[PDB]
Every structure is written in structure tokens, then in C-alpha cells.
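Holo prediction — 4-(1~{H}-indol-3-yl)butan-2-one.
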Amino acid sequence: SVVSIPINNAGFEDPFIEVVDDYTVDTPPGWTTYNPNNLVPEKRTTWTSNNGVGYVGPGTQFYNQLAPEGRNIGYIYLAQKPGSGVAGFEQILDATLEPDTNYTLKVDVGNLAGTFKGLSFAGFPGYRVELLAGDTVLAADHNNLFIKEGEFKTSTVTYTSTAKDLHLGQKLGIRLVNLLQDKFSGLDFDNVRLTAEPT
Amino acid sequence: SVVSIPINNAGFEDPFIEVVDDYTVDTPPGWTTYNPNNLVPEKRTTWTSNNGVGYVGPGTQFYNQLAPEGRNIGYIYLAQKPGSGVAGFEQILDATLEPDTNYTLKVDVGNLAGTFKGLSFAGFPGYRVELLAGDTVLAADHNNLFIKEGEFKTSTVTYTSTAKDLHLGQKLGIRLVNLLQDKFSGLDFDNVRLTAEPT
Amino acid sequence: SVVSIPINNAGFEDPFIEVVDDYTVDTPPGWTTYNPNNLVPEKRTTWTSNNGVGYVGPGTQFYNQLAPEGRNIGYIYLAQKPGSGVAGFEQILDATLEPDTNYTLKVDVGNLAGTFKGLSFAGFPGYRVELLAGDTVLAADHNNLFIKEGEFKTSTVTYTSTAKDLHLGQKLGIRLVNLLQDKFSGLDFDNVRLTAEPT
Amino acid sequence: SVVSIPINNAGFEDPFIEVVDDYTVDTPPGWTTYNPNNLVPEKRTTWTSNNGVGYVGPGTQFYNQLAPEGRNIGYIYLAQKPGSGVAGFEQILDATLEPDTNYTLKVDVGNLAGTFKGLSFAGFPGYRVELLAGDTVLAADHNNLFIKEGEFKTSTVTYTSTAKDLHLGQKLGIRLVNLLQDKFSGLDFDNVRLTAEPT
Ligand SMILES: CC(=O)CCc1c[nH]c2ccccc12
Ligand SMILES: CC(=O)CCc1c[nH]c2ccccc12
Ligand SMILES: CC(=O)CCc1c[nH]c2ccccc12
Ligand SMILES: CC(=O)CCc1c[nH]c2ccccc12
Ligand SMILES: [Ca+2]
Ligand SMILES: [Ca+2]
Ligand SMILES: [Ca+2]
Ligand SMILES: [Ca+2]
Ligand SMILES: [Ca+2]
Ligand SMILES: [Ca+2]
Ligand SMILES: [Ca+2]
Ligand SMILES: [Ca+2]
């Protein structure tokens, strides 16, 4: 009776990227930029904070594995110094919070590795994965997993609704957040999945 | 190889309380009131927002069990309506963040049950347990456990430091947070423990 | 007496670039990539050898002046080590080599300055500017100017045709070449101009 | 603070030639034959590519002036058709490239005029003058000057070293190149001078 809640572009496979380690610098289709501190500008460049999709394919210089799912990951890179705020991806779903339901949200989180011409990718900014109803964070994993350089790990967030939950009927949502707690302050997400099961 | 990090009044056993289901309305010794939204006044009653310790002893009216540890729990009760903000307890420790270390923070979180003077304690405000270095939240459990009316369940929060962590040498800290996401908007904590071991 | 020979996209003003210091990684329209050593890949990323246009605008991090002309410059960046070859821009013109004519080719050449997060732009690869007829290099300036970090200088290349020049009647051409003699091995060009004067 | 850099046989005065318009067919002492395309054979004759020195003295048949310097010039004659490659003279010096130094190389380049035994010396193959460090061309004048039939003109090549030049400490060199871009495909050089000056 476990049911899949549809998420748009849940594995960041849109758009198709042809070249390994190439990437876009526009919000991935189906998602919005979560930007409570306005860290990410509307027009992004190499020199600014940005997010988008990237192709982790054979020959990749960033990971010791391929993408958790398909070709692509979704990334958020913050140029501002640690402590400046947070940003990432948000998506509000069509499904709504239902009573006496177990919700299970899984997302792979990646720590990009390596080096480019004096730029180091060592380090990680921390992550948070949030399940929302309306604009309440029902449950979140704030940086509990250790993610080695050049790997992805699956974050799992759980929530059980009761028959009289205040947020019943409000739209579900997901946020994938770069915490900007350290540098290199880029991190990746992939393979977002949300299931619901009668309790 | 697992080491205990000292925490003051980690079980809220101070002060001693004589009578079952009695309680204080002042910040527990060794803790401060985490009050980022000004919900808890300096001068409390039983009918303002408050915090304190409570004796969950034999035949308690609020739980199906005794305190997780010793006689007492620590409680936070917020009178303001859901969504007004958060508050709880904070303690800054003497130990500082060390590299290549796996930190494990555990706290028992209680969901009060029953009905007292015509007030129902049905419902739960949501919790967050935070592990700090300095004023940074390294890791947190934001409301992932499902806690039935009248029971405690253990929250586990984990952080792994690296060799170059920006926060090395900063004081470790703990926050125990009432999220005020619903009513009844009181919750309990007990048996705070923090360990460290080589990664 | 002196006539301007038209050149397409002679100031790299196509495409339009909105944000200061942003750039493209594709061959600018009207030009081709001069690629005698195959150093520049057909499909470029931020990480590969590349060419394109770059907006040298108010508040540029790269120069102590604005673009020699308009908004943009044309750049060629080579990732391969010094000595691996050359690459740049080429444009074959409609104009043909006429007798008893003094040709004067000028181009501004830029030595990009600064740093970004560990990337260093100190150093300069060397330049060569070539005037062609057909496949023949009639005249060239191979790296005679000294160009300080963060400025542009005008290179001038001259050829005088005789009554019975072998190449008479063949199409004129221009090449702008990154010599890859040192690092940082990026350099910029702007404001290409070619004049013809009967002798 | 400008200094002369010693060059051997810098005016091609060795060997002494007694009879006006007589010449040698062997590589001038102190120079080597620059031969990247094998156009000049080890054993030279009448109908072969050759180099040598030539006495441009009173009443010379080939010029409207005496030699730029002393009695002789150095010549390079290439018998192969235009486009077959290049050849000329090379000399590696004892001086090495030093930092923060302005180098100025000057060379007189000659366009032979007239007739010799029913053969027209009209036309000119083009020249290139190169300053080297090791086997890197630091700077060159590729054919920028216009040289009338029967005259010499001074080519000036300049290079400026920085503190961190990749080629620091390598031996300076000079190349004087016949480009074989047209016929009559002989040219002459004289009076090679190289100066260095702290920048
Ligand atoms: C290097 C960055 O943090 C931004 C680009 C990026 C972040 N993650 C990626 C995965 C595959 C290709 C590109 C990327
Ligand atoms: C009803 C409250 O939230 C305040 C008192 C209280 C909160 N939790 C308790 C546990 C044992 C005894 C008293 C208490
Ligand atoms: C920094 C590089 O070498 C490639 C991009 C680039 C080279 N030159 C530039 C001028 C303005 C904006 C960007 C550029
Ligand atoms: C074109 C030639 O006669 C080859 C020898 C030569 C080339 N240039 C010269 C000038 C004076 C005397 C002889 C020569
Ligand atoms: Ca994917
Ligand atoms: Ca990393
Ligand atoms: Ca206790
Ligand atoms: Ca309750
Ligand atoms: Ca321009
Ligand atoms: Ca530079
Ligand atoms: Ca001489
Ligand atoms: Ca001639």
C-alpha cells in the first residue's frame, strides 16, 4: 500500500547534458531556487552563487561513482562566506498532507571532490533535507550523515501524520538546502523520492 | 574508544522535587532558555510560556512510564499560537570541536498525555535537537521521530568532523527545542548524553 | 585614400553579455577557432580549453580599464601546458589582396589580471597577430609588445603588396593567436581593424 | 643601463672578400644553417639552395647602397618553389634570459635588385627575425617592413621579461629567416645587434 508521490524532475535528468562534467547555471526545471537570504542572483555566472544540473558521467573528475540515478545531479554552489545564509532547491507538490499516513522522503546528497588549477573542492558546506506542509517544516535531516569526498549518501526524512494534525490538507513540499557552514561550499542532490503509506 | 563529553544537569535532576507531578517554572540549573523569538518571559507563571523541571514519578498522570532517567524531566511549554516561533533549552559545553571525530548526541523526547483541570494534553508541538559548535548548528534532528501520547523516544543526532573543519576549537553546545508547530504545545526532554569517538 | 576593410563582429560585441565578467565558451559568431594543434575541443565546458566573448564592464575584476571597444572582448584560454601548441581566432575576409597597397592591421591585446578563490591570472601566454592572404601569413606581430597585467595594448601589423605579388587576388584573412608560451594562458583581443591605402 | 649582448660574426664580416659582388656558398662562421624543412643541403653548389656571405662594395650590381655595416652581408637563397618551407641562419648566444629586462634585437634586411646572367632579382621572399630563449620564439618580426628593390631596412624585435618568466636562465638565440613566400627567393641580412636593459 506504499504509494509514490509524483515529483517533477526528481532526478534532475532535465535538461539532458551531453558533455561529462558540464552543467547548467539556471534553476533546474520543475524546481524553484530556495533563496531566503537572497544569496543566489537571478543571473548567474562562474563568479557568482549558482544552482543547476550537472552530468556525472563516465570519466567524471568530481566523484568516485556515477550519479545516484541516471546521468545528472542538481547542484547548489554558494560563493559568499560561511555563515552568510542558506539556499537551495524547493518544490511544492500537488499531493496534500493526509491523516494517519507515514511519509518517507529520501534524497542522495553528494560531496564533490578534487581540484581544478588551484581551486580545491575539498570540504563540504553541510546539507539539510526538509519535508514541508504549506510553509511548515514537518521534519528535516540537518546534516546528520557523514559524506566522504567524492561520494553520495542517502538522507531519509520521516513524518507520521495523526488524525487531527494542524496542517492536514496543506500542500506537501520538499527543500534541499546548502547550509553554507564551510567550504568548498558546493553540494549535490539526486534521486528525490517521496512515499506515503496508510499507518 | 568511545568517550563521554560532560554535560551539567544532563538529566534535569537538579533541583530535587518532592511531590509526583510537581514542577518548577524557572530555567533548570546549568541550562539557559533558548529564546530566539522572545516567547518565554524572564518572569514566568504556570500560565505564561515557561520552562523548568518536572517530577515524573510513580503513578504520574501524564505518561505511561516513569522519567527516562532518575526522577525528573525538563519541560518547555509555549502559550503562543502555533507558528509564533520556537524556544527551549541551551547549554554550551567546556569541550570544543575536535577533528576526525564522530559525535553522537542522544536525548529522550516526551509527548505528554492526559487531561488536567479540563485541559487536554493531546497533540504535540514538534521537537528539534541541535548539536552546536560556537553558534553553528553542526547537526540536528528536526522532528523525525513519531512519538505516541504518553511516551518518550530517544532522538539521535550525529556529526562527523574533518581535519580542516572551520569550527574546530569552538565550544560544543546543545539545544533542545519546542517547535510550536501544533498544540498541546508542551514537551519534555531527559537524559542528554554526548559521546565522541575516532572516525 | 585610406579605406576600411570590413570585418564581421570585429569587436566581439556579439553575443550581448548582461553581467560584468560573464563570458561564453563557444566560438564568437563571424569567427572560427584557429586550432592547428587540436587543443580546443569542439564541445567546451568551464573546465576545458575554450574561446568566446567576455564582458569587460564597470567593476570588472580582470582589468584596470574597460574593453578597448564597446562591452566585450574575445578571449582564448588554453588548459594544456606551455609548449603544447597554439590556438585562437581566425576570420577569412571577402576583400582580396590588391597590388601597390599598404595594409594596416590593428588589434588590442589584453593581459588579464587578478585572482579568484585560489585561481591566479598572473602571467601571460604570448600573442601573435597575423595578416593572411589565402593560406600564407603575409605579416605578423609575434609577441613584440609588453602588456602589463590588467591592461590592453594595440598591436599593429603591416604588409605592402607589389605590382606582381604571388598572392594577389587571394582572400585576406586575420588570425589572433594564443602562443601558450607561459601561464596564466588566457588572453584577450578587441577592436580588430584593417585598412588599405594605395601606395 | 643599456648593455650590448655579444654575437659572433654579427655583421657577417668573416670571411673577408676581396672582389665586389663575390660571395661564399658555406654557412658563415659563428652561425648555423636554420633548416627545419631540409631545403638547404650540406653540400651546396650553383643550382642549390645556399647561404653565405657577400661583398656589397663600391659599384655593387645588386643594391643602390653599400652594405649596412662594413663590407659584407649574409645571404640565404632558396631554390625550392614558394610555399616549400623556410630556412636561414641561427645563432645560440652565451647570454641567458634574465628577469625584468627589455631586449631589443635589430637586424638590417636586404631586398636584392638587378640582373645577374639573364636572371631577374625582382621580387622578395619575405623575412622573419626571431629572438629565442632555448627553443621558444619569445618575439619575432614576421615580414612587417616594406623593403624596396635594392635597399636595406632595419627590423626591430622586442621582448620584455617578467620576474617569473618560464624561460628564465635559458640561452638567448637569434634566427634570421627566408620565408620563401615568393620569388626572387633570396634575401640578405646585416648588422645584427641585441641590447638588454633593466626595465
Ligand atoms: C563544481 C561545482 O560545484 C558546480 C558544478 C557542479 C557541481 N556538481 C557537479 C556535478 C557534475 C558537473 C558539475 C557539477
Ligand atoms: C503541563 C505542562 O506542560 C507543565 C508541567 C509539566 C510538563 N511536563 C511535566 C512532567 C511532569 C510534571 C509536570 C510537567
Ligand atoms: C577568465 C578566463 O580566462 C576566461 C574568461 C575571460 C577571459 N577574458 C575575460 C574577460 C572578461 C570576462 C571573462 C573573460
Ligand atoms: C643572389 C646572389 O648572387 C647570391 C649571393 C649574394 C646575395 N646577396 C649578395 C650580395 C652581394 C654579393 C653576393 C650576394
Ligand atoms: Ca539523476
Ligand atoms: Ca568537497
Ligand atoms: Ca532525568
Ligand atoms: Ca501530547
Ligand atoms: Ca569590443
Ligand atoms: Ca595575466
Ligand atoms: Ca656587414
Ligand atoms: Ca628582389
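READOUT: The longest strand of chain B covers residues 186-198.
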